[PDB]
mmCIF file of N, CA and C in Angstrom:
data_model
loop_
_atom_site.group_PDB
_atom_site.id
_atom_site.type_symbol
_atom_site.label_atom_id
_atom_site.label_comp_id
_atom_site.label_asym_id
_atom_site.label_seq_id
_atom_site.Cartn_x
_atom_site.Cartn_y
_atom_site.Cartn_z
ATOM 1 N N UNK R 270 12.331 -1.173 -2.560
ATOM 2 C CA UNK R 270 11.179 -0.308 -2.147
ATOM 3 C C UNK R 270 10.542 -0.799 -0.856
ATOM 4 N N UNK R 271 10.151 -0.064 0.049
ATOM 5 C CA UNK R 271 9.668 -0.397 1.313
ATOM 6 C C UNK R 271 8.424 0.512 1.796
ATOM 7 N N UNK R 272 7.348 0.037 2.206
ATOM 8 C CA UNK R 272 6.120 0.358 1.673
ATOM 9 C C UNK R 272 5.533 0.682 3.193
ATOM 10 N N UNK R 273 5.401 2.390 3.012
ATOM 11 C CA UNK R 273 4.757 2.913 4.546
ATOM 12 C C UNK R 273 3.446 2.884 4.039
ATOM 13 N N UNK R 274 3.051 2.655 5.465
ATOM 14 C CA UNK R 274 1.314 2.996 5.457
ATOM 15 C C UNK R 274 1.333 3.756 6.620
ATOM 16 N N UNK R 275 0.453 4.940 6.639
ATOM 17 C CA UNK R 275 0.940 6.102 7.238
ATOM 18 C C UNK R 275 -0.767 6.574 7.548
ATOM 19 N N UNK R 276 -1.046 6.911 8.837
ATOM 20 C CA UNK R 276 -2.600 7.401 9.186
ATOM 21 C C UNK R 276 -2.252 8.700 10.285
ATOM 22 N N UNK R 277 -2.689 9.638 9.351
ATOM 23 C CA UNK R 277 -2.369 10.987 9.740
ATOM 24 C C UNK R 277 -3.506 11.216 10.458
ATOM 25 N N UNK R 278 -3.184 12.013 12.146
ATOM 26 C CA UNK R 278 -4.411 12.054 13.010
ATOM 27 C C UNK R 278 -5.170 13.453 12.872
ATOM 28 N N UNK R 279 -5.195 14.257 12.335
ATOM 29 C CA UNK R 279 -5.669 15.536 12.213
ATOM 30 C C UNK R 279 -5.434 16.009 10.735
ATOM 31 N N UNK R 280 -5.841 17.538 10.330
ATOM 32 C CA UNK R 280 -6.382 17.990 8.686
ATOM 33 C C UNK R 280 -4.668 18.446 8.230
ATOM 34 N N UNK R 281 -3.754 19.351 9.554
ATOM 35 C CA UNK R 281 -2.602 19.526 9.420
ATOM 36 C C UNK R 281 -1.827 18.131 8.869
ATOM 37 N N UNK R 282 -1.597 17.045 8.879
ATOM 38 C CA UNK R 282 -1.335 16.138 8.713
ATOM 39 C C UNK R 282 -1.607 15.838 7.703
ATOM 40 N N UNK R 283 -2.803 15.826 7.448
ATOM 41 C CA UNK R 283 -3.063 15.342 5.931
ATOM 42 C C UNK R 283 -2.835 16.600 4.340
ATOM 43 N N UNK R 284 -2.792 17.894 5.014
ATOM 44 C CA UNK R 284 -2.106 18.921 4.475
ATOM 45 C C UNK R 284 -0.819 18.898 4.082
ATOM 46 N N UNK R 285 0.017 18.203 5.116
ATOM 47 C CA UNK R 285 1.819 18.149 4.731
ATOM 48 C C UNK R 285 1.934 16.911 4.091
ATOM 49 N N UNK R 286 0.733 15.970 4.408
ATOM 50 C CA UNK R 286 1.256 14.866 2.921
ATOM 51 C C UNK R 286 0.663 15.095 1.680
ATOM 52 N N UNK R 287 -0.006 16.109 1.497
ATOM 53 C CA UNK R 287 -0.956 16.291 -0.172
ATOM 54 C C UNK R 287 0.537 17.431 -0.028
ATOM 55 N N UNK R 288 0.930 17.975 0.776
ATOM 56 C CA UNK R 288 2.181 18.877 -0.206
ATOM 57 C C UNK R 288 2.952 18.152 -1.025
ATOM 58 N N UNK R 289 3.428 17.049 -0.163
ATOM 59 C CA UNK R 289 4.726 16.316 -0.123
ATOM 60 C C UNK R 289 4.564 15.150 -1.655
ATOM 61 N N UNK R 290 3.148 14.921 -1.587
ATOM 62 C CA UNK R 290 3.324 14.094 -2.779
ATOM 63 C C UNK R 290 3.064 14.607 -3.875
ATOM 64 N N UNK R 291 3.000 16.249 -4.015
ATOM 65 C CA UNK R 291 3.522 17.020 -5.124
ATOM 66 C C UNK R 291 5.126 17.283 -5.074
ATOM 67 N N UNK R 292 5.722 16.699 -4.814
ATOM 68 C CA UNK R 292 7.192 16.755 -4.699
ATOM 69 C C UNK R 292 7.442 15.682 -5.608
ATOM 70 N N UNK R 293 7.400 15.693 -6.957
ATOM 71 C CA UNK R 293 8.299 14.572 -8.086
ATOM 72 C C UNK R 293 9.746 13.858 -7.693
ATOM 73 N N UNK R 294 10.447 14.827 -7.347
ATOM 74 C CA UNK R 294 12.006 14.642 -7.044
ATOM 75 C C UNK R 294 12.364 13.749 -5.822
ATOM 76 N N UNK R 295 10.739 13.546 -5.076
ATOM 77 C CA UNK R 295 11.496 12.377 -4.121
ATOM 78 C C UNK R 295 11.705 11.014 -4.509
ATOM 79 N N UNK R 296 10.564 10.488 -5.704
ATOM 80 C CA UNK R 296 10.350 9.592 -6.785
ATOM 81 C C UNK R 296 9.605 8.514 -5.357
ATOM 82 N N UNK R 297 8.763 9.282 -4.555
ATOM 83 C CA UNK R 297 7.670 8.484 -4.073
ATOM 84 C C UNK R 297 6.521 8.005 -4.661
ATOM 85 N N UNK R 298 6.003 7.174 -4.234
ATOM 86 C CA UNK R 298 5.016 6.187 -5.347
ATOM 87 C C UNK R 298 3.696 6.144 -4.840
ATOM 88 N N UNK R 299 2.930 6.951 -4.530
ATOM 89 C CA UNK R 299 1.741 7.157 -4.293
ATOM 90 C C UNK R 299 0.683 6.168 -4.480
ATOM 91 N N UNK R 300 0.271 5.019 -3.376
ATOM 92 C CA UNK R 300 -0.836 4.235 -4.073
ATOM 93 C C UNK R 300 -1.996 5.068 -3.796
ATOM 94 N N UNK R 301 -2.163 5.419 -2.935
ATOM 95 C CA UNK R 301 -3.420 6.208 -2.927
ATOM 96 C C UNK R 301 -3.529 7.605 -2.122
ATOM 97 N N UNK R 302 -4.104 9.096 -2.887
ATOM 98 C CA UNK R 302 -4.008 10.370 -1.458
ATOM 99 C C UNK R 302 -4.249 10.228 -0.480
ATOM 100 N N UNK R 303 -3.785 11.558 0.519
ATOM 101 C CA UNK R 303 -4.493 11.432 1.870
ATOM 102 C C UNK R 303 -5.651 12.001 1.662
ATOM 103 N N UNK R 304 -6.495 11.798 2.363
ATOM 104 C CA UNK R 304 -8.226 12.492 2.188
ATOM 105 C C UNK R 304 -8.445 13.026 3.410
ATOM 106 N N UNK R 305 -8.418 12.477 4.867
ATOM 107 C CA UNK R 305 -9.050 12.892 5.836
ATOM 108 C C UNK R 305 -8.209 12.126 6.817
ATOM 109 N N UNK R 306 -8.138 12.729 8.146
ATOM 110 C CA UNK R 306 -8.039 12.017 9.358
ATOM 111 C C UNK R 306 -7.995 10.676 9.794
ATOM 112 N N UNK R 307 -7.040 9.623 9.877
ATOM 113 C CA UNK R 307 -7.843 8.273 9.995
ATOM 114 C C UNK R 307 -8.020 7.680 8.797
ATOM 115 N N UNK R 308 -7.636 7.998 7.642
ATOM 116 C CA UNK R 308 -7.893 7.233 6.167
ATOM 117 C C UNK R 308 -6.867 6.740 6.174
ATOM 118 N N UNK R 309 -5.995 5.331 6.079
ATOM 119 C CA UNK R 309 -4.570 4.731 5.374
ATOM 120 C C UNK R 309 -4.102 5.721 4.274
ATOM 121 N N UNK R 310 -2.398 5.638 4.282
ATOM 122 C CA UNK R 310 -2.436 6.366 3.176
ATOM 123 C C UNK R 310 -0.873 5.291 2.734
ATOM 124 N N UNK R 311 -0.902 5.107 1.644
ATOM 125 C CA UNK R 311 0.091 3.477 1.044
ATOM 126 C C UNK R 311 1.047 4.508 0.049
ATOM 127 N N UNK R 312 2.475 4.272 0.050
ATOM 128 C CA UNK R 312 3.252 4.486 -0.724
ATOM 129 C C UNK R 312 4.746 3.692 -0.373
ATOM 130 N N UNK R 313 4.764 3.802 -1.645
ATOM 131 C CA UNK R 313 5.817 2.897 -2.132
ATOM 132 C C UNK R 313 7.139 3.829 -1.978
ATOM 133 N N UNK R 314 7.936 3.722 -1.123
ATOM 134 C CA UNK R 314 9.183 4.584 -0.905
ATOM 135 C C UNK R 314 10.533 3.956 -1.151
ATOM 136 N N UNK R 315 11.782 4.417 -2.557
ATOM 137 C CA UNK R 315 13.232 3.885 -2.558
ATOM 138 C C UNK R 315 13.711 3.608 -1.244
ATOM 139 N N UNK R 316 14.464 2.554 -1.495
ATOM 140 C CA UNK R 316 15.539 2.187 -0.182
ATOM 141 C C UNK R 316 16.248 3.310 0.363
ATOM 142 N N UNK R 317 17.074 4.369 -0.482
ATOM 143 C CA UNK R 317 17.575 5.300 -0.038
ATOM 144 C C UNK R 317 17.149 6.782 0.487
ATOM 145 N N UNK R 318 15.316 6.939 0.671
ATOM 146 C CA UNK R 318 14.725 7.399 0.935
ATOM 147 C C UNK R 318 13.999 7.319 2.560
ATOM 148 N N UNK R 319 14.297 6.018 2.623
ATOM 149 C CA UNK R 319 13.583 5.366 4.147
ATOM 150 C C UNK R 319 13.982 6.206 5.632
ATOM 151 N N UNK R 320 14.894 5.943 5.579
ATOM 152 C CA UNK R 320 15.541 6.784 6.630
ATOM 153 C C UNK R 320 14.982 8.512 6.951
ATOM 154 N N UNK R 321 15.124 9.450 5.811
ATOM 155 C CA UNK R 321 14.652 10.435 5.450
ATOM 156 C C UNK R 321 13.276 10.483 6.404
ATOM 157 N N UNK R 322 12.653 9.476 5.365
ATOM 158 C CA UNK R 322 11.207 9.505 5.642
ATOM 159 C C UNK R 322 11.173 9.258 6.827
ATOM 160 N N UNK R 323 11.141 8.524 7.793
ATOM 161 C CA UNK R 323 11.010 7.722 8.816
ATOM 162 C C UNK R 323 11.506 8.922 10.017
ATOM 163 N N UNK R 324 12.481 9.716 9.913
ATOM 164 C CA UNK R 324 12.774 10.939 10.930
ATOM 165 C C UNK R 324 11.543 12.380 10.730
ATOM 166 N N UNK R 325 11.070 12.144 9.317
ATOM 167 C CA UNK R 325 9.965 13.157 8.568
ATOM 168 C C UNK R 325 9.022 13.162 9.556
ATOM 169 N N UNK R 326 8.273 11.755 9.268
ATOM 170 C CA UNK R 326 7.200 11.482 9.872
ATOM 171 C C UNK R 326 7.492 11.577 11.647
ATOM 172 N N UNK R 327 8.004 11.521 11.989
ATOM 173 C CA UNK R 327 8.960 11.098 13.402
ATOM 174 C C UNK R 327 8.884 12.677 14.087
ATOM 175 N N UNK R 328 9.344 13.433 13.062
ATOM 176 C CA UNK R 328 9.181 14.537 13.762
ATOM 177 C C UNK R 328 7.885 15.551 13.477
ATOM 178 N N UNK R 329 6.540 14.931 13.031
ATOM 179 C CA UNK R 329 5.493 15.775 12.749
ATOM 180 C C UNK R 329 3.875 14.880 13.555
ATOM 181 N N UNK R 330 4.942 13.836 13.777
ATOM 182 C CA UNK R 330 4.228 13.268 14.966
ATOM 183 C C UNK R 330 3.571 12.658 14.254
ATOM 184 N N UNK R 331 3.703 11.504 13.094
ATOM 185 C CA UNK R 331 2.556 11.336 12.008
ATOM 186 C C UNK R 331 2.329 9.928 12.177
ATOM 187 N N UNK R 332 1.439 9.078 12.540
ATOM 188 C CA UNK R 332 1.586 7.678 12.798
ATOM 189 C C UNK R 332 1.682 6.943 12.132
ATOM 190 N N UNK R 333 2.369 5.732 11.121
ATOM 191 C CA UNK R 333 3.047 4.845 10.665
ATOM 192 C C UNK R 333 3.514 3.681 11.268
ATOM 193 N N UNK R 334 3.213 2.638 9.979
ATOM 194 C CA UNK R 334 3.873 1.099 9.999
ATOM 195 C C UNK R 334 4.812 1.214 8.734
ATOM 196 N N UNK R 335 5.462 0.449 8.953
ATOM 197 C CA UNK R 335 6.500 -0.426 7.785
ATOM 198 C C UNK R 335 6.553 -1.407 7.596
ATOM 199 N N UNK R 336 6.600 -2.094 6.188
ATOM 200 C CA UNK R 336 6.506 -3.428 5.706
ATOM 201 C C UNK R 336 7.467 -3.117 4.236
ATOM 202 N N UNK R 337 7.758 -4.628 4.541
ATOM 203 C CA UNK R 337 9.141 -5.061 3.348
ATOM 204 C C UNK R 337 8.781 -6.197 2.853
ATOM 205 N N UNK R 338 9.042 -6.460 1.801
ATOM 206 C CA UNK R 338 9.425 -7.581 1.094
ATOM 207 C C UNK R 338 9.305 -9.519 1.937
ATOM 208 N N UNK R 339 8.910 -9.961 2.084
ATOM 209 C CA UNK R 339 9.183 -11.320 2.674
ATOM 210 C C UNK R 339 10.312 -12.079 2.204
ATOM 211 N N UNK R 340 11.565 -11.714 3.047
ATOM 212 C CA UNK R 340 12.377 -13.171 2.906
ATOM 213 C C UNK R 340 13.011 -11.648 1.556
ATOM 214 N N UNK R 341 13.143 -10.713 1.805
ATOM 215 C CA UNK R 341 13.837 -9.894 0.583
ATOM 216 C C UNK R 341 15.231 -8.863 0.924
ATOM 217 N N UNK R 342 15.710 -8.212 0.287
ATOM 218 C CA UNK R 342 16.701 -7.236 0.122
ATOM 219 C C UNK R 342 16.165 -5.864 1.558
ATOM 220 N N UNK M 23 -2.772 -5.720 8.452
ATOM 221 C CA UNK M 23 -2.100 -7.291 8.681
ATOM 222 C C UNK M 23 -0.433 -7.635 7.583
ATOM 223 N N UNK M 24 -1.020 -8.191 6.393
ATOM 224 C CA UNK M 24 0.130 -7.875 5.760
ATOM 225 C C UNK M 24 -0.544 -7.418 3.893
ATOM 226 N N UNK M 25 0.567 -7.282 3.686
ATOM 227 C CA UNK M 25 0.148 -6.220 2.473
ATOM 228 C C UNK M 25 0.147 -7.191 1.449
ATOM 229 N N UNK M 26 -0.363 -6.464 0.189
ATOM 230 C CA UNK M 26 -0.278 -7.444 -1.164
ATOM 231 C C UNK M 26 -0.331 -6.179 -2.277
ATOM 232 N N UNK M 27 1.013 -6.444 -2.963
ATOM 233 C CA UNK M 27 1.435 -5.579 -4.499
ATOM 234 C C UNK M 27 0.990 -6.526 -5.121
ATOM 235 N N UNK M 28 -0.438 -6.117 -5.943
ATOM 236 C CA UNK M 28 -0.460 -7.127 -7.135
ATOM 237 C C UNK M 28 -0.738 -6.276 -8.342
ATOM 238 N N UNK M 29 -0.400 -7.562 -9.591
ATOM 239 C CA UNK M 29 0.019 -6.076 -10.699
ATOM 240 C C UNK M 29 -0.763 -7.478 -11.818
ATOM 241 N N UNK M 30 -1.960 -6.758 -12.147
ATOM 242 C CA UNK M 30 -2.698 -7.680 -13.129
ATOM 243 C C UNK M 30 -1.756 -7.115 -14.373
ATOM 244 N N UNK M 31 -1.500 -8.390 -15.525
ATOM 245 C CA UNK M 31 -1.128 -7.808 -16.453
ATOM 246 C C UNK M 31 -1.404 -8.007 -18.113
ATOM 247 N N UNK M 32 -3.043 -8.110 -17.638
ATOM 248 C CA UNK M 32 -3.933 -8.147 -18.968
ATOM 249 C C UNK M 32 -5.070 -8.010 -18.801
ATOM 250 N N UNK M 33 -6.217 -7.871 -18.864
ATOM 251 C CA UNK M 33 -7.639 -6.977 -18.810
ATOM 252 C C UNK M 33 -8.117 -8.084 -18.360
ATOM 253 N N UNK M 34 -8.465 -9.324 -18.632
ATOM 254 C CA UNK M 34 -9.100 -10.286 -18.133
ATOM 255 C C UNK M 34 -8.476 -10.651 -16.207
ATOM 256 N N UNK M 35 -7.513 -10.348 -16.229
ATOM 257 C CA UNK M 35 -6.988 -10.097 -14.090
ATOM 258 C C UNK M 35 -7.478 -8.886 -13.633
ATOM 259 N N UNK M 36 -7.537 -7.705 -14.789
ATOM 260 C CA UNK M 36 -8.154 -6.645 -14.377
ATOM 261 C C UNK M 36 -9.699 -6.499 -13.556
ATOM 262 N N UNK M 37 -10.298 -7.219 -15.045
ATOM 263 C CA UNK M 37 -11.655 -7.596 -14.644
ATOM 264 C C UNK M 37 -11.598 -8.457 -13.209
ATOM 265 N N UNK M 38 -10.972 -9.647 -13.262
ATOM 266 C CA UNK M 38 -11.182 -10.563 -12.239
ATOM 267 C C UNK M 38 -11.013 -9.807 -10.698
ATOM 268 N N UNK M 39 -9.787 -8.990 -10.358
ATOM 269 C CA UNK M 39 -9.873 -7.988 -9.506
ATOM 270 C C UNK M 39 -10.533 -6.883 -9.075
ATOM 271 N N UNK M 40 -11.282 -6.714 -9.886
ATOM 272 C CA UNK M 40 -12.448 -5.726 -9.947
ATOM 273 C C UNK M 40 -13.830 -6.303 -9.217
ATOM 274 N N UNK M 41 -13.777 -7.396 -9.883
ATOM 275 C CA UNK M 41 -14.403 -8.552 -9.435
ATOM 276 C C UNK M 41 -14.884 -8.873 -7.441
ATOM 277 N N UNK M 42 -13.519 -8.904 -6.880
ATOM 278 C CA UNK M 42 -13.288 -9.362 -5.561
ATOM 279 C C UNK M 42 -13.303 -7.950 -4.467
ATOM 280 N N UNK M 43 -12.456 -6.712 -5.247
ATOM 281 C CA UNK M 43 -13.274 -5.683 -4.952
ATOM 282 C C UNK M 43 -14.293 -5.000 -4.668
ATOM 283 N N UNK M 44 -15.230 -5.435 -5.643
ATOM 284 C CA UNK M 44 -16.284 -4.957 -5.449
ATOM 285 C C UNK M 44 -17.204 -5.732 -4.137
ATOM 286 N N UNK M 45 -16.755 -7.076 -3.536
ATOM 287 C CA UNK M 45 -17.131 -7.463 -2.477
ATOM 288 C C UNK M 45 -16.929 -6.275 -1.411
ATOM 289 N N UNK M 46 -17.970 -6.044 -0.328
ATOM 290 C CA UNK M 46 -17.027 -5.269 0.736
ATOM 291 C C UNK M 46 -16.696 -5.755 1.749
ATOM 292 N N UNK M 47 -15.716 -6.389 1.970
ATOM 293 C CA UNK M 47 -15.331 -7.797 2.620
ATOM 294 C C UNK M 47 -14.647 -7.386 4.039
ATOM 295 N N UNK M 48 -15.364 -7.357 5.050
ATOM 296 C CA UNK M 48 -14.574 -7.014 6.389
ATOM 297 C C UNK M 48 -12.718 -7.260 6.709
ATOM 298 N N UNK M 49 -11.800 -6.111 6.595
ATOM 299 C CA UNK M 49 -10.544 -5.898 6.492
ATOM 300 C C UNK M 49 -9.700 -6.715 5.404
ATOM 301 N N UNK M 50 -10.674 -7.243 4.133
ATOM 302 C CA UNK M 50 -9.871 -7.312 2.706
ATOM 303 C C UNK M 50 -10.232 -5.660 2.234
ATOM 304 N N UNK M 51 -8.540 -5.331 2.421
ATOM 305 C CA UNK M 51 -9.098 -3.719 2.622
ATOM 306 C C UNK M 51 -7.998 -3.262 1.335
ATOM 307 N N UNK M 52 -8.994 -2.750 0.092
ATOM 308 C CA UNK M 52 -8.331 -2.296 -1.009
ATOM 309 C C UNK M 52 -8.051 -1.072 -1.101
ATOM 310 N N UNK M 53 -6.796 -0.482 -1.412
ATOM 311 C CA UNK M 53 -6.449 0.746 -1.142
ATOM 312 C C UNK M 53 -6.203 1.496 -2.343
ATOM 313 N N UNK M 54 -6.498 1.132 -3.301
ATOM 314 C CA UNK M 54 -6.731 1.421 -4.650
ATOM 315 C C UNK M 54 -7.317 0.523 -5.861
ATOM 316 N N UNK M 55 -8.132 0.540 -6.360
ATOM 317 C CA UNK M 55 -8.460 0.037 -7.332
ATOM 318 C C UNK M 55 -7.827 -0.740 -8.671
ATOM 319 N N UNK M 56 -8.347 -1.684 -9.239
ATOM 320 C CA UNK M 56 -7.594 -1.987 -10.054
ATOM 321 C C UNK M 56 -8.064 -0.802 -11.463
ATOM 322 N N UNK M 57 -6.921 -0.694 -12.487
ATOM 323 C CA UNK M 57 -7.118 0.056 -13.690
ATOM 324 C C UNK M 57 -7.079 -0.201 -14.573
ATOM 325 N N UNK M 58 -5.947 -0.660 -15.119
ATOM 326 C CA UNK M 58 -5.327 -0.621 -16.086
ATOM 327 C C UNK M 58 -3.877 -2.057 -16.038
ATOM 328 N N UNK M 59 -3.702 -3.509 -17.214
ATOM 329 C CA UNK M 59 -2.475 -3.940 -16.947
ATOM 330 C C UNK M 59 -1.436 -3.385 -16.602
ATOM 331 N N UNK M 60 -0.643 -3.653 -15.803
ATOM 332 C CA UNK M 60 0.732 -3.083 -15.581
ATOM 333 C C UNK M 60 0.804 -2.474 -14.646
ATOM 334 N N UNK M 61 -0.853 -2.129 -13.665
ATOM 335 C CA UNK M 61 -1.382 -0.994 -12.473
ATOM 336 C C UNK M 61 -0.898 -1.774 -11.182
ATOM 337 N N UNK M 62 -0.447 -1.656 -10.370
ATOM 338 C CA UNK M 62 -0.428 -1.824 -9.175
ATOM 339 C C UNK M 62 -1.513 -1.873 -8.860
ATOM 340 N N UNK M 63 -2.049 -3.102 -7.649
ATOM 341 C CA UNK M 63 -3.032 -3.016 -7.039
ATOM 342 C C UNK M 63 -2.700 -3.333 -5.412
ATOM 343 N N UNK M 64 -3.189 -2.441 -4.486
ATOM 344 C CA UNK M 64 -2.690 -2.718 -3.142
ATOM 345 C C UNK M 64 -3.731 -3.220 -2.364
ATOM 346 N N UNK M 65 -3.326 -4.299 -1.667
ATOM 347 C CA UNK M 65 -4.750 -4.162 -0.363
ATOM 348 C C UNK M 65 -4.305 -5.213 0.708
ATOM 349 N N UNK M 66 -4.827 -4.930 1.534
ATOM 350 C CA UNK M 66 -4.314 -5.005 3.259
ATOM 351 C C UNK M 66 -5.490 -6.423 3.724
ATOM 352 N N UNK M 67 -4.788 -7.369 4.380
ATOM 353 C CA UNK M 67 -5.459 -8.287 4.532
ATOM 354 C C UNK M 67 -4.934 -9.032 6.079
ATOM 355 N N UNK M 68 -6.147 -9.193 6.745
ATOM 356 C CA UNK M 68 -5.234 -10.501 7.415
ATOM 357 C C UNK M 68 -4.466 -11.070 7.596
ATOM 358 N N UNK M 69 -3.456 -11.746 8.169
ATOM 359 C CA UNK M 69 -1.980 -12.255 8.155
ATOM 360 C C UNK M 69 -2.251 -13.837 7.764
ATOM 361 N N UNK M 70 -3.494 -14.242 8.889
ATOM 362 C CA UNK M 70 -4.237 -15.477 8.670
ATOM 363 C C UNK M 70 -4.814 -16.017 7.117
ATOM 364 N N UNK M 71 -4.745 -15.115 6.702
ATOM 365 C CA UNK M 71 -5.489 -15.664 5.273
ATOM 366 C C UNK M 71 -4.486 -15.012 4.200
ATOM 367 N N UNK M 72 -3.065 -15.325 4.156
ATOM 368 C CA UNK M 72 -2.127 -14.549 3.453
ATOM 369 C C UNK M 72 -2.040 -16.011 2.763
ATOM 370 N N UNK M 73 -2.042 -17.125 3.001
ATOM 371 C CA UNK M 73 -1.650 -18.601 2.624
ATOM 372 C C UNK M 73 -2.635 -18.536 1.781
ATOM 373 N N UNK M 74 -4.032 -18.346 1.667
ATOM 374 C CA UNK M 74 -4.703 -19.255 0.866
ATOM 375 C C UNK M 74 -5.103 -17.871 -0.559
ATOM 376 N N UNK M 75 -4.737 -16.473 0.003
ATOM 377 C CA UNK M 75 -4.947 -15.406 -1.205
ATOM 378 C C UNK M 75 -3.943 -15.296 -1.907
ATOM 379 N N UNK M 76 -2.666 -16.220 -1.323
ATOM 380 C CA UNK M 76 -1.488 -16.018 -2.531
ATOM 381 C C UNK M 76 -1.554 -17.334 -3.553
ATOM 382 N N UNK M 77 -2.197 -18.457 -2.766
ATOM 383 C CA UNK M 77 -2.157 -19.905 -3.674
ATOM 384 C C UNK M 77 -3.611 -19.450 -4.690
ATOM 385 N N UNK M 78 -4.200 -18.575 -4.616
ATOM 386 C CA UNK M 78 -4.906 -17.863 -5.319
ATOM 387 C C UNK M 78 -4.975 -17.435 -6.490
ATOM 388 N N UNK M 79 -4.120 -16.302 -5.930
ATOM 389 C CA UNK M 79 -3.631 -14.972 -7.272
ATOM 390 C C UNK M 79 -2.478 -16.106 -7.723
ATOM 391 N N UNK M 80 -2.002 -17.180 -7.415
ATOM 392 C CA UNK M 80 -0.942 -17.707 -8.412
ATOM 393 C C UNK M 80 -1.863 -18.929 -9.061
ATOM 394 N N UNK M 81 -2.584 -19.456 -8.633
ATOM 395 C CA UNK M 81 -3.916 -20.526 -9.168
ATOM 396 C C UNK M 81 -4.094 -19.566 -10.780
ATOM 397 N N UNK M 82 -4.218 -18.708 -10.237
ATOM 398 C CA UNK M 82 -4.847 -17.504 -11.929
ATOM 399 C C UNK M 82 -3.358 -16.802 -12.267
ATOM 400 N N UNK M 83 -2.019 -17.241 -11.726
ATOM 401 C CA UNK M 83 -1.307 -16.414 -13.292
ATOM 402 C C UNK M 83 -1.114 -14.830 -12.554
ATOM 403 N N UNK M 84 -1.521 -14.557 -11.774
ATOM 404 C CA UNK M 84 -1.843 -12.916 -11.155
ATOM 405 C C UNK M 84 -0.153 -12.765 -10.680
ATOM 406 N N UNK M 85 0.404 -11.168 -11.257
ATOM 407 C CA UNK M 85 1.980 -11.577 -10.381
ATOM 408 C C UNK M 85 1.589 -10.906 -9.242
ATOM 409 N N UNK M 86 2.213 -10.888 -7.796
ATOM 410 C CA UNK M 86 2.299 -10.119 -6.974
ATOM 411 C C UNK M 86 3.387 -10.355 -6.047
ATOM 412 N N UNK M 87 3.616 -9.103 -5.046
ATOM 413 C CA UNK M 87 4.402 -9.494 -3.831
ATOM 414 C C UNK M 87 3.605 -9.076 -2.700
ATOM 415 N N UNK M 88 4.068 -9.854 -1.153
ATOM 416 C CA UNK M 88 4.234 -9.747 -0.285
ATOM 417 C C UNK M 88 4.951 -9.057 0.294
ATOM 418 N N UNK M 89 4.259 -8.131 1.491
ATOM 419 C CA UNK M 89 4.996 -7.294 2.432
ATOM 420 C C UNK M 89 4.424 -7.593 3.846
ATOM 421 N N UNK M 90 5.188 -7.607 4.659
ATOM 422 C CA UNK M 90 5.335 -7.943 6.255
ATOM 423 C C UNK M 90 5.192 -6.715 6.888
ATOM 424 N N UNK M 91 4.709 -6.353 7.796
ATOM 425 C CA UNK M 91 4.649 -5.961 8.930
ATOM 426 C C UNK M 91 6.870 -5.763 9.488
ATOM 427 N N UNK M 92 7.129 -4.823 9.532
ATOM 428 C CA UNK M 92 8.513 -4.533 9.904
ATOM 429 C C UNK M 92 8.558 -3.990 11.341
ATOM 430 N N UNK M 93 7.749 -2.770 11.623
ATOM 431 C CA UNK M 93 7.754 -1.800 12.550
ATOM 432 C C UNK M 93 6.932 -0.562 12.374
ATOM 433 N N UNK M 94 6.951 0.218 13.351
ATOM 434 C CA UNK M 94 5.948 1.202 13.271
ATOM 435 C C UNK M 94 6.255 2.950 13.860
ATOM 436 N N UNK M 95 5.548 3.591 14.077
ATOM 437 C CA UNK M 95 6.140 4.417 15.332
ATOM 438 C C UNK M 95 6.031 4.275 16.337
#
């Protein structure tokens, strides 16, 4: 699991991630909703999901870090 | 800075995390609350003070992991 933290700059933004984490079938791990503009938003994303995600966000212009494991898989 | 998965896993870590939370501690930044044993608890800290909050949560028995800083957009 590899853990985005993701700060969406506008309401559109925070609209396509309250869709997205009604999506069960991606088996994303929600630590906490998006609320507003500028709020962190933490989830826990499968290894075989990363990639996906990472072109998602990439192409909706959505700003993000990534963090892994220390010294892990 | 860098992240911290910690996962109290009996009511008395619950409490104790609830505890340090409720400080509002300039960028010990909790991104969800503690709940329930077995809950994930996330929060964003300093890189500088990653040494002395993990000899910590393991001083008390607390499990957790570490996540790094990888990349961003």
């Amino acid at each position: 699991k590899t853990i985005f933290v993701i700060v969406p700059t506008n309401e559109e933004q925070v609209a396509f991630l309250e869709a997205l984490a009604k999506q069960d079938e991606l088996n994303f791990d929600w630590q906490n909703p998006p609320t507003e503009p500028g709020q962190p938003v933490v989830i826990l994303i499968p290894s075989d999901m990363v990639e996906w995600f990472l072109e998602m966000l990439k192409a909706k212009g959505i700003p993000f870090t990534v963090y892994v494991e220390e010294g892990g898989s």
